[PDB]
Symmetry: D2
Subunit: 215 residues, 4 copies
Amino acid sequence: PAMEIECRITGTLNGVEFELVGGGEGTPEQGRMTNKMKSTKGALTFSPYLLSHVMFYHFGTYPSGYENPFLHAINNGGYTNTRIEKYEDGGVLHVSFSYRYEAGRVIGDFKVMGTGFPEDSVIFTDKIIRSNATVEHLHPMGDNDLDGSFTRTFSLRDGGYYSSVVDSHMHFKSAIHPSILQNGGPMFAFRRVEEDHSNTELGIVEYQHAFKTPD
Amino acid sequence: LPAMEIECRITGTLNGVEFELVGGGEGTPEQGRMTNKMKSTKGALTFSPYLLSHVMFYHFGTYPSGYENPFLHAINNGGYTNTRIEKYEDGGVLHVSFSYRYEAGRVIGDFKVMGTGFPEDSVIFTDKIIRSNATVEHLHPMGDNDLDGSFTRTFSLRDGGYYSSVVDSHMHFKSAIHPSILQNGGPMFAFRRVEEDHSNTELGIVEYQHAFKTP
Amino acid sequence: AMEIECRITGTLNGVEFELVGGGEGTPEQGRMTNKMKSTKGALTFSPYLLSHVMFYHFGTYPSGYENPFLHAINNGGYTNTRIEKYEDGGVLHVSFSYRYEAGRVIGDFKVMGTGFPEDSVIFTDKIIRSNATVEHLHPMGDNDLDGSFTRTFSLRDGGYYSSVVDSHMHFKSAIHPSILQNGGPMFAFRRVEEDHSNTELGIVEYQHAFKTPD
Amino acid sequence: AMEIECRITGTLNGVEFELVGGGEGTPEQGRMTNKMKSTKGALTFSPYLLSHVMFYHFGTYPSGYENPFLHAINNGGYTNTRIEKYEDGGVLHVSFSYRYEAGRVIGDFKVMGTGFPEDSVIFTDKIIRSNATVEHLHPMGDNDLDGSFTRTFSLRDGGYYSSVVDSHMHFKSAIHPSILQNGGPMFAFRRVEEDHSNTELGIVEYQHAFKTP
């Protein structure tokens, strides 16, 4: 039985307010989740592709012998994620993720502040056609904190790319699952999305698979 | 002019721990001087109060003859926002957003801080910081409504050393920036220094700000 | 298989070093070896700092793709320039150049490291091994790839020493079309097996590129 | 005045360049000049990219302070290494080394630029001048200074191209006590007057350090 997902995203991009609400479902054992959300303030003023990675690390597979620490945290006080994303044209996206849990349900309430995107930014065009896959390097900073880092790109219609560098800080109320904490080497997290967006209605399917070594 | 009154609220989280301070002071832009004294409403801070000195109003800086402080100028024409990303040498990050409201003779600042990624052994969780040192910010426009700022900032440590950060700021103006900033003649520099009188519950600053084209 | 010859010359905080040696590798196995000896006595810093300086030609690529570094051998070659920023402020600038002879790759590599503090873990015996990495690679135009990865070393006491690496690879001819026509990144997993003293350094490195980890 | 001799060798996106020349400077006036000629033909990128590679010795310091770069001439000197990150992704790594004789400084500088995209403004004639900067300098222990600054260029049709520069200066002996005993940063204001073609480059540079402006 897939876990239900509810989600709200609220924020500002270059000072323009936006808000989306929606949900989907996910099966952590398959590393799969879906999320569909709709704007509550009319059309977005920027590319909906910017929000794909804002639209739940709980739904990722982990290798034999390791436990998804985000899933583990559900029963032991949870975690928050805070990401700082620096785009190649100077835009900055700051995102904070907080969660609550009910029986068979995760509810996310996410806050986004994007600033410094130039007027000529690709995010104010329909040039972005998709988000590309990423592999995040995760390692513990201490018993209650994981540090994540990855490079992310979008593909553009004329064949180019738009890139960012992402740094993430995951803070856990209780100690991180011992399989992750005691590893003595990083864990990698591969992620990819399938996006079906308009300017008012956004939808993703995401796959997340953590690994020590690729096949 | 009589000094402008200042009212200030700072709300935020540092590595998940909530804090809030409220207070105020006053400032005289023609002197480049302002004061702000604030008290924590959530008991003693869990980190060095010096970390908040540069969060505790660019309106109060002098500008050279032939130029006008664009922050001061914005008061009567829709105002501005400031958003800063500060990267500390031990990996901690502060994201700070500044919002303002104005009255005759008064500015009211409501500021939001998110600090994450500071390691347990960070100098900020000790009493080692003894003062904030002076800075010179490089300011230059991106089009008529946006300024970018950047500076390196250091703190002095009890033991004689330094703790450093790099700060990048984006200011977005509702109306065109004062034209003295927009003539394609290069950046404006803003020298700032503070005198700090802090405890872990009561913080106080006198700040001086002086902009210049040449020293 | 190909023979490997290698020279590394550099300075760390101004102190000159030079290593010389070589090995061999089998691109189809994604495997290479390199053993090098210092020519200026013992290194003044941890030999593990040089493991990732001691040949992208020797990486496997997924079915349908060709290793572009390997491809470049018969088409003008490539250079790599990396800037590595360590969590203590140290910076390593490394540039890699290659020549090719029959059955052989010769690398001549230049390293300039600066700003490592006196208390740097590099001036101790705390580093015990390099950890695995996954590099994100994507084309910046037809003749250049951009790479980025986070790298950590494991420390004796259980901790990590971290860096961020950005790489620019410039090709004299167009990058192999399987990589240019790919329309997203290629990921390069690397791991190294190190057997170092302060004068004699040895690695076995495995390199495996992938689009997806399953 | 002190005579200056200078060579700059490097590559940008792979393409080798070399310039040689020199000038003179007067430290008490914070002024120096340098004119250099390309020896590998016309440059393939904007000559304004090289103005800040074309001698910290020639800056003024406030009353009671000594220029630590000038002072180091007699006790082993210093090296400077800079990493410059441009807003379009290009990177310049620049290393500076110096040799001294009576009345002369000789600089031999190495530049490696990589990662500038084919559409970069550096491959056009859009840059028309380098703008002024203020470097933040502070010590890391007795033998090392760290520098940081933002630098902009002005463009023909208005607006700016920007970079961030981080520098590491390493001294053979301890930095002058007036700099180490300062208890906070020193600021170094610099500006340049440029007269460049793609084969012949020339600068006049002024440098003035201060604790407060």
